[PDB]
Amino acid sequence: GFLGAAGSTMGAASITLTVQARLTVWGIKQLQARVLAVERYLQDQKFLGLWGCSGKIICCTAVPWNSSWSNKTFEEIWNNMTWIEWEREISNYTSQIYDILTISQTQQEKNEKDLLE
Amino acid sequence: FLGAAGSTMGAASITLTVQARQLLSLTVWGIKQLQARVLAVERYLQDQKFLGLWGCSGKIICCTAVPWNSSWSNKTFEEIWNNMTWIEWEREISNYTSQIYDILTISQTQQEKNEKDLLE
Amino acid sequence: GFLGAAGSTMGAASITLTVQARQLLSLTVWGIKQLQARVLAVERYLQDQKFLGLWGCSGKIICCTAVPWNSSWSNKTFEEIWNNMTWIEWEREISNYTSQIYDILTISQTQQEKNEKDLLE
Amino acid sequence: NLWVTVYYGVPVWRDADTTLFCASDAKAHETEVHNVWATHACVPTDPNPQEMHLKNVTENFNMWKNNMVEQMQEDVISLWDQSLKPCVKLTPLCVTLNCTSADDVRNCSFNMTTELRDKQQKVYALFYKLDIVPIDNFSEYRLINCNTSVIKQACPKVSFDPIPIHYCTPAGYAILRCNDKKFNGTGPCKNVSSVQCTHGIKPVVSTQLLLNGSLAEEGIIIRSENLTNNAKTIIVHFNESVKINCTRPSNNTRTGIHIGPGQVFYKTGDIIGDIRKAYCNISGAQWHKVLGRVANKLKEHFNNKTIVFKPSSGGDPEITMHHFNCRGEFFYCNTTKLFNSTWGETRDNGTITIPCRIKQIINMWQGVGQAMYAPPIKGVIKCLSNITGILLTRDGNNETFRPGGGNIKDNWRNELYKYKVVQIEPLGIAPTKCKRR
Amino acid sequence: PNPQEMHLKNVTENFNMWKNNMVEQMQEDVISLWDQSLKPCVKLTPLCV
Amino acid sequence: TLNCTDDVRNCSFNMTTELRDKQQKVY
Amino acid sequence: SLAEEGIIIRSENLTNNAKTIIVHFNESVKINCTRPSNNTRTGIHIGPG
Amino acid sequence: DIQMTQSPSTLSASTGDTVRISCRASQSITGNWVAWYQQRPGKAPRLLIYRGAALLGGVPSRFRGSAAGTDFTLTIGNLQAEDFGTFYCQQYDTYPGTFGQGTKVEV
Amino acid sequence: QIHLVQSGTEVKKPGSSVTVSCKAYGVNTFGLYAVNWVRQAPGQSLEYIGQIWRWKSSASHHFRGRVLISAVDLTGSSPPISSLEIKNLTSDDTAVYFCTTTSTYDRWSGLHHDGVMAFSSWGQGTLISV
Amino acid sequence: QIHLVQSGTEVKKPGSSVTVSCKAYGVNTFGLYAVNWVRQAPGQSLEYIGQIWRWKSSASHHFRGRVLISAVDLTGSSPPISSLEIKNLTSDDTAVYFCTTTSTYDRWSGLHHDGVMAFSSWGQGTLISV
Ligand SMILES: *[C@@H]1O[C@H](CO)[C@@H](O[C@@H]2O[C@H](CO)[C@@H](O[C@@H]3O[C@H](CO[C@H]4O[C@H](CO[C@H]5O[C@H](CO)[C@@H](O)[C@H](O)[C@@H]5O[C@H]5O[C@H](CO)[C@@H](O)[C@H](O)[C@@H]5O)[C@@H](O)[C@H](O[C@H]5O[C@H](CO)[C@@H](O)[C@H](O)[C@@H]5O)[C@@H]4O)[C@@H](O)[C@H](O[C@H]4O[C@H](CO)[C@@H](O)[C@H](O)[C@@H]4O[C@H]4O[C@H](CO)[C@@H](O)[C@H](O)[C@@H]4O[C@H]4O[C@H](CO)[C@@H](O)[C@H](O)[C@@H]4O)[C@@H]3O)[C@H](O)[C@H]2NC(C)=O)[C@H](O)[C@H]1NC(C)=O
Ligand SMILES: *[C@@H]1O[C@H](CO)[C@@H](O[C@@H]2O[C@H](CO)[C@@H](O[C@@H]3O[C@H](CO[C@H]4O[C@H](CO[C@H]5O[C@H](CO)[C@@H](O)[C@H](O)[C@@H]5O[C@H]5O[C@H](CO)[C@@H](O)[C@H](O)[C@@H]5O)[C@@H](O)[C@H](O)[C@@H]4O)[C@@H](O)[C@H](O[C@H]4O[C@H](CO)[C@@H](O)[C@H](O)[C@@H]4O[C@H]4O[C@H](CO)[C@@H](O)[C@H](O)[C@@H]4O[C@H]4O[C@H](CO)[C@@H](O)[C@H](O)[C@@H]4O)[C@@H]3O)[C@H](O)[C@H]2NC(C)=O)[C@H](O)[C@H]1NC(C)=O
Ligand SMILES: *[C@@H]1O[C@H](CO)[C@@H](O[C@@H]2O[C@H](CO)[C@@H](O[C@@H]3O[C@H](CO[C@H]4O[C@H](CO)[C@@H](O)[C@H](O)[C@@H]4O)[C@@H](O)[C@H](O[C@H]4O[C@H](CO)[C@@H](O)[C@H](O)[C@@H]4O[C@H]4O[C@H](CO)[C@@H](O)[C@H](O)[C@@H]4O)[C@@H]3O)[C@H](O)[C@H]2NC(C)=O)[C@H](O)[C@H]1NC(C)=O
Ligand SMILES: *[C@@H]1O[C@H](CO)[C@@H](O[C@@H]2O[C@H](CO)[C@@H](O[C@@H]3O[C@H](CO)[C@@H](O)[C@H](O)[C@@H]3O)[C@H](O)[C@H]2NC(C)=O)[C@H](O)[C@H]1NC(C)=O
Ligand SMILES: *[C@@H]1O[C@H](CO)[C@@H](O[C@@H]2O[C@H](CO)[C@@H](O[C@@H]3O[C@H](CO)[C@@H](O)[C@H](O)[C@@H]3O)[C@H](O)[C@H]2NC(C)=O)[C@H](O)[C@H]1NC(C)=O
Ligand SMILES: *[C@@H]1O[C@H](CO)[C@@H](O[C@@H]2O[C@H](CO)[C@@H](O[C@@H]3O[C@H](CO)[C@@H](O)[C@H](O)[C@@H]3O)[C@H](O)[C@H]2NC(C)=O)[C@H](O)[C@H]1NC(C)=O
Ligand SMILES: *[C@@H]1O[C@H](CO)[C@@H](O)[C@H](O)[C@H]1NC(C)=O
Ligand SMILES: *[C@@H]1O[C@H](CO)[C@@H](O)[C@H](O)[C@H]1NC(C)=O
Ligand SMILES: *[C@@H]1O[C@H](CO)[C@@H](O)[C@H](O)[C@H]1NC(C)=O
Ligand SMILES: *[C@@H]1O[C@H](CO)[C@@H](O)[C@H](O)[C@H]1NC(C)=O
Ligand SMILES: *[C@@H]1O[C@H](CO)[C@@H](O)[C@H](O)[C@H]1NC(C)=O
Ligand SMILES: *[C@@H]1O[C@H](CO)[C@@H](O)[C@H](O)[C@H]1NC(C)=O
Ligand SMILES: *[C@@H]1O[C@H](CO)[C@@H](O)[C@H](O)[C@H]1NC(C)=O
Ligand SMILES: *[C@@H]1O[C@H](CO)[C@@H](O)[C@H](O)[C@H]1NC(C)=O
Ligand SMILES: *[C@@H]1O[C@H](CO)[C@@H](O)[C@H](O)[C@H]1NC(C)=O
Ligand SMILES: *[C@@H]1O[C@H](CO)[C@@H](O)[C@H](O)[C@H]1NC(C)=O
Ligand SMILES: *[C@@H]1O[C@H](CO)[C@@H](O)[C@H](O)[C@H]1NC(C)=O
Ligand SMILES: *[C@@H]1O[C@H](CO)[C@@H](O)[C@H](O)[C@H]1NC(C)=O
Ligand SMILES: *[C@@H]1O[C@H](CO)[C@@H](O)[C@H](O)[C@H]1NC(C)=O
Ligand SMILES: *[C@@H]1O[C@H](CO)[C@@H](O)[C@H](O)[C@H]1NC(C)=O
Ligand SMILES: *[C@@H]1O[C@H](CO)[C@@H](O)[C@H](O)[C@H]1NC(C)=O
Ligand SMILES: *[C@@H]1O[C@H](CO)[C@@H](O)[C@H](O)[C@H]1NC(C)=O
């Protein structure tokens, strides 16, 4: 999660994805926050690993883009639309895309195991 | 997750991936959830540490170059995968899990050393 | 435990780095003294992997990087780095260029990912 | 020609301080009877010892800047305090005592509350002279810990039996053990070793003599923060442990009275049989042998001057008497017979019987810990302990060494002197010839 | 919001009602909930007269 | 109950002491 | 903290008079408060410690 | 074995005049094993900088250092009267440690 | 804090042996400290004579066999003491002599490196004329 | 809750200028809400006239230059007021004008995007005959 260049359109912002890194009242406020942050990071990586994208900031996949998600061309998506606007546009089809990505990675793993006989 | 726990290994193995844990998204009960969450995080991280040391960093089904010793099981492939379930199998090979873990780690070490040697 | 070959020079120790390989780990006063330790260790391990992943390794004990060795970091040649130098001594020698090396590795992995995406067209 | 290569798991470490959790033995609360040290909560259970000898590794140890001893101090104080929260509060008997005046006990009478808030009962209780301060025949008195704090009784099931407590370390850290003989606790260490868990440090609290501790390997070791400074206590460690036998040979009666709803206050009623002073027996030959060895070791560090042990100057019984805990009854012994000699050597070789005075209003920690009241123990109590060290305090031709003196931490500095908390950094960058991403 | 159950087909599991730890945990939780619910309440120590 | 005689009031009350038996008059 | 360019009026609902108008100043008035009486603190003992 | 030389053999400046004292080595000190000293007349040397650019406690923050290969420099922002004196350049990267000649700063 | 004091000032005939003493106030022990002996010529730069580090004595090649360095740590009466004994004095030794101690406790301080260290605490100095 | 009331029914001679005023009871500010003007011809479907969104006013291409949208937010006396002025009235302007306010606070509501929004609250409506 790198805010900044967040009003920048997708084409300009994707380039600017960069180096990610480099009892008391306050006693439990720190611990609960730390546990929640750890659980959220491990869920983001849990999703990212199921698609074969573990350890990759920009991951390409073999899932064709259905037009039911959007019939907006590459230039229209990447030249005059920001990331928040895009994720609002495709906010209804995130679960379906997650399922398709998981199924595609499963198919790729099965095919890889088959080719190894 | 335990679904298809009565299916023989071969039949279930295809169903291990049909659903792959996808699409998740100071009182008496305060301590319970915190301890549970920390324990679950630690256990999941430990499972990945074992799974990562063998080269299977992000693979649900991971092939390995370790040959199957016959002392671990003399049973043939069809006798393992057609008339045996996962609980029965892991009970059968319950004494050789530590040894197999060590052999997997050693094999991945050998593969990584050979890969580094080739790059030189 | 990662600390076994600690007086051994880096050349001899690097063999024993993978021998260990961390192969197997298979509200009272002590109630919080363990929970805090658990959370701190978990997040420290996750930070180590997050650094390791950003460089493209993500699960390799000995990870190979395409970054050339700048001479300002160390003018010492490979033999006198690996035959008369231990790991603590080495990391003390290069203690001033760890942040720069981290940044260079992250930039290099970003460049390699961009090239991989460009080749895929 | 050379390219960066990243290694994970390198033997690189730094000094650090963190929270070390407990790991008691499988006995839990000593087969499940509540210990004041809460040793079933030391959830870790210590099954196997993993150690590694760090070859060709020299690490600098400074036992006087260890944070392990301070963590032990805080943990022990917190465990002691938390065991007294459930127990009875003894505010009803901060009351004027009509003590019979002309043995150390005193027959005192006072009006004490009953289970009913309306009614009051007159109570007769035998209070020790050490727990009584004159109010200023039948003079009027009051308990000593009345103008400072409110005392709390000890729960009947809570047992003060020091059982070993291990200080283990979280993942990503390690504990360095010195394993080096005759270690002064301050300097280089040649066979440093990496352990996950410390040995069992018994939380034994004592003032002038360290009992039941870990005893040295090859000789008597003298450890002081600053030898020139006379305000720095000299901690002596023993190759061999002198044996002390402490008894209270008087059968005592605890007669619980009800001072509220469900609150029973246990008082000493009378002695069934002879009245016998408490004492501790120490063999003269063994004690004088060990004291001669200590005198020689002190001559080594003190310019070969004649070493004169002299009895403690005086003050509070806690400060200037050997204090310990036999079976839940706290003793305050006179060590004047023990520490009285000049070397460079009393020729007695028989048992040394030293008087002791039992107390009940206990303040083990000088204000930082709570004040408690120890209920009497019914039968005669006998405890068999080995002394493994001394705490001396030199005062400014010869050097004189009063016994006792020190902080509470000095009891555990003979235990945690060789352990060092160390943080492991597993990432490493080295130049190698791989060249591939 | 939703049950999220699933039926383990061809799975036989042995149940012992009298060695369940869930009931012991329920007892401890209920006792603790009563205990904490009465801490911020009147003490009625004057009534013992 | 106070026996009183930001304008202060000089109140008199007899209250507890370190000893539960004895009470001290306080001004 | 004091405002940057001008005095700012912040109310939850201006029309409602039960909502407290909050005024922010871009200039801070200085207040000097003093209690000029030499006072004596005498500590009596009401219990053990 | 490594001979370290100091750029300005003597220097001239006054209060408020920041001076850059430079130093060069016979080899490449990539570990930044260089230390800086000040010697007032009739007194012992005082350590100001260790490990290239690290400051001791009790040393004014006006003193700062930089490390770049064989070039090591010492800068004194807002030079003051007590700062005047001979400055030394030391290397402890290899045995034995070696000192630069000197840089006298005078009014 | 820490204060280093040396043994006054001596003027001796050539060929004699001079002993300079170094009494370290504030040093808990020479196990965690290293005494480094350096000499300053009347107009020249400072030179390095030798050291004791972890109770091991060493001197630079120029001073090998011609100097002796000894040290004893805390006693009841005296602080840690270090002694520099030059043998066969010559007119070239007309220089101020300094005694220095640095904390070699933590390996990541940067003041020390493989036994070759900076100089953190400086004594008054014993000018020697001959 | 939220209630919108408008000026009232008016009869105008063709060529005149009519102003419809909309007062929003329950809108904390027009910085967070957005006022959208809607006309409904007798029997026909609803049309879109113009809006003020984030204190920026715009109108549909059909109505550009023939309409003004103005608004002022909360004051001590009156709730936020929005005004609809139709210059150069013609017989085609006989429709039940409506006032709407939609909450544009959170971007993930779905009621709005890029300044084009669904109408959540509807005013009473002022029939205009000309
Ligand atoms: C918290 O802090 C916040 C700031 O930090 C603060 O925000 C501020 O809020 C105030 C409100 O309280 C804002 O001030 C108001 O802004 C309104 C919007 O103004 C914009 O739009 C108009 C109209 O723009 C159209 O027309 C012009 C000219 O033709 C074009 O150039 C435009 O492009 C646009 O045209 C398009 O749209 C048309 C349809 O509308 C189409 O037909 C057309 O084809 C196009 O598509 C502009 O005029 C405004 O520009 C102004 O500023 C520029 C320079 O910046 C000037 O050059 C210019 O002359 C303008 O002054 C702007 O772009 C205003 O409508 C509103 O004005 C009313 O109030 C002022 C007093 O302040 C009056 O003087 C004025 O006459 C208006 O009063 C009328 O409306 C009220 C509302 O009902 C009536 O009650 C009143 O009776 C009066 O009606 C009469 O006149 C009308 C015509 O004026 C007429 O139609 C009626 O029928 C009747 O005769 C006011 O200025 C302010 O901007 C905010 N500031 C910021 C930074 O956000 C917030 O309030 C604070 N919160 C609280 C709780 O306090
Ligand atoms: C806790 O416990 C730990 C251990 O358990 C404990 O650690 C111990 O600390 C002891 C200190 O209290 C320590 O004992 C001292 O050790 C000193 C080091 O000894 C080594 O080096 C010397 C010198 O080696 C030179 O020289 C020889 C001979 O030429 C040569 O063979 C060597 O290779 C080396 O030469 C190299 O260096 C030269 C420069 O020095 C160079 O010129 C050469 O070319 C070459 O490069 C050896 O001789 C030893 O054998 C060791 O190898 C040691 O110096 C010191 O001796 C002093 O004390 C003795 C009594 O114990 C005296 O008998 C002795 O004479 C010394 O006393 C002189 O110095 C003191 C210092 O102030 C002075 O006050 C005295 O008056 C006296 O001066 C006079 O004599 C000297 C000559 O001796 C003259 O020069 C003067 O001018 C005067 O006339 C101690 O022996 C012990 O080793 C250490 N143990 C361990 C295991 O670590 C720790 O201290 C404890 N903690 C506490 C708080 O107690
Ligand atoms: C900041 O603070 C102000 C002042 O407190 C507040 O303004 C008030 O807003 C509320 C909105 O919830 C207003 O309540 C509504 O007002 C309208 C019109 O009000 C005017 O006219 C009435 C009658 O003459 C006057 O009393 C009033 O003072 C105004 O002059 C009323 O039409 C509404 O009627 C509803 O109330 C009935 C009970 O009284 C309900 O049975 C019913 O819900 C009525 O609404 C129904 O009417 C529709 C037909 O028109 C019908 O089809 C629907 O079914 C609908 O349910 C209601 O009283 C209140 O008047 C405002 N007060 C003032 C002084 O202006 C702001 O809202 C507040 N801001 C924020 C952000 O909270
Ligand atoms: C030093 O250690 C010795 C032994 O390690 C301690 O002596 C032992 O003390 C325990 C309790 O403190 C005794 O156990 C108790 O015995 C009584 C009487 O039989 C019994 O009623 C209790 O339930 C409990 O079992 C134990 O017998 C005793 N052992 C010996 C040999 O004396 C000693 O107390 C320690 N010293 C200090 C100061 O802690
Ligand atoms: C190489 O890395 C080491 C890593 O520690 C650097 O040492 C550190 O240097 C900084 C900069 O001077 C020190 O911070 C300063 O500390 C002083 C203490 O008096 C303080 O007054 C200043 O305000 C500032 O915070 C830091 O303490 C020091 N750390 C250690 C352990 O020595 C060193 O500077 C690096 N080398 C170069 C050439 O940058
Ligand atoms: C251990 O305790 C002794 C005694 O308290 C400490 O020795 C004292 O050290 C201080 C330095 O902090 C000495 O003060 C300095 O002495 C020199 C020489 O007199 C003087 O020029 C300075 O102005 C300053 O006064 C002090 O004299 C010395 N006292 C004695 C009698 O030895 C020692 O520092 C402590 N050691 C540790 C481990 O801290
Ligand atoms: C769109 O495509 C995805 C996969 O590419 C598919 O799952 C989904 O059913 C498709 N939707 C429609 C409406 O065809
Ligand atoms: C986009 O695709 C949809 C159906 O998938 C179609 O109705 C629409 O006309 C397309 N738009 C363009 C610009 O091709
Ligand atoms: C994106 O769309 C807006 C409005 O539709 C348009 O003004 C802009 O020119 C478009 N982007 C590009 C690069 O043309
Ligand atoms: C079984 O074979 C493996 C190699 O795959 C070997 O490492 C292991 O030692 C063998 N088992 C026994 C009991 O020798
Ligand atoms: C499993 O083994 C039994 C042994 O008799 C055999 O009858 C059965 O057919 C085997 N399972 C399958 C699926 O063939
Ligand atoms: C530093 O690197 C240069 C090569 O540019 C080499 O000639 C020189 O010997 C090196 N010095 C050291 C001390 O490694
Ligand atoms: C390390 O360097 C020293 C001196 O440069 C050399 O004598 C030694 O041989 C080197 N190490 C090894 C293992 O050769
Ligand atoms: C103390 O008790 C005795 C008898 O028990 C009684 O005679 C005497 O008056 C009492 N003294 C006080 C001060 O109450
Ligand atoms: C350190 O200990 C090991 C075994 O504990 C022993 O073999 C070794 O000799 C010791 N170190 C030295 C220097 O003797
Ligand atoms: C202590 O160790 C042994 C007994 O374990 C004893 O024989 C030896 O003489 C003693 N050492 C000393 C301090 O003299
Ligand atoms: C010791 O005293 C207790 C206290 O009642 C008594 O029960 C026991 O019999 C006594 N023992 C002897 C030997 O008299
Ligand atoms: C202490 O008791 C033990 C065993 O009970 C005995 O061996 C020893 O001699 C006794 N010591 C004295 C001084 O009585
Ligand atoms: C002295 O008693 C303790 C009690 O725990 C025991 O551990 C120790 O071994 C005894 N001393 C000797 C020399 O046996
Ligand atoms: C204080 O004590 C006196 C007797 O000593 C008593 O008469 C008085 O009533 C007490 N104070 C109050 C407020 O009752
Ligand atoms: C804001 O700026 C300064 C206060 O720092 C003052 O001169 C000016 O009048 C202020 N503005 C208002 C509206 O108070
Ligand atoms: C005010 O009174 C207090 C109370 O004793 C005293 O300590 C202080 O010095 C007085 N100050 C002046 C200025 O008189």
Plain-language structure description:
Chain A is mainly alpha-helical and 117 residues long. Chain A has helices at residues 10-15, 25-50, 74-79, 83-89, 94-115. Chain A is extended and about 55 Å long. By secondary structure, chain D is mainly β. In chain D, the strands form nine sheets. In chain D, strands 16, 17, 18, 21, 22, 25, 26, 29 and 30 form a nine-stranded mixed beta sheet that branches. Chain D has a five-stranded antiparallel beta sheet with strand order 2-31-13-15-4, with no helix packed on it. A five-stranded antiparallel beta sheet of chain D has the order 8-7-6-10-9, with no helix packed on it. Chain D is globular, with a radius of gyration of 26 Å. With 107 residues, chain H is mainly beta. Chain H has one domain: Immunoglobulins (Immunoglobulin-like). Chain H is built from no helices and eleven strands. Chain H is globular, with a radius of gyration of 13 Å. Chain I has a single domain (3-128), classed as Immunoglobulin-like, CATH 2.60.40.10. At the C-D interface, helix 1, helix 2, strand 1, helix 3 and helix 4 of C face strand 1, helix 1 and strand 32 of D. Strand 1 (62-68) of chain C pairs antiparallel with strand 1 (3-8) of chain D, so a sheet runs across the interface. A molecule of 6 linked components (NAG-NAG-BMA-MAN-MAN-MAN) sits between chains J (1, 3, 5, 25-26, 28, 79) and G (13, 15-16). Chain C: Disulfide bonds join 57-63. Chain C: Residues 92-121 form a coiled coil. Chain C: The chain crosses the membrane at residues 1-15. Chain C: It is a single-pass type I membrane protein. Chain C: It is found in: Virion membrane; Host cell membrane; Host endosome membrane. Chain D: Glycans are attached at residues 98, 107, 111, 147, 191, 239, 245, 251, 304, 334, 340, 386.
Features:
part of a larger assembly; 10 chains; D: 437 residues; mainly beta; nine-stranded mixed β-sheet; five-stranded antiparallel β-sheet; 9% helix; 38% strand; globular; I: 130 residues; Immunoglobulin-like; seven-stranded mixed β-sheet; four-stranded antiparallel β-sheet; binds a molecule of 10 linked components (NAG-NAG-BMA-MAN-MAN-MAN-MAN-MAN-...); binds a molecule of 9 linked components (NAG-NAG-BMA-MAN-MAN-MAN-MAN-MAN-...); binds a molecule of 6 linked components (NAG-NAG-BMA-MAN-MAN-MAN); binds a molecule of 3 linked components (NAG-NAG-BMA)
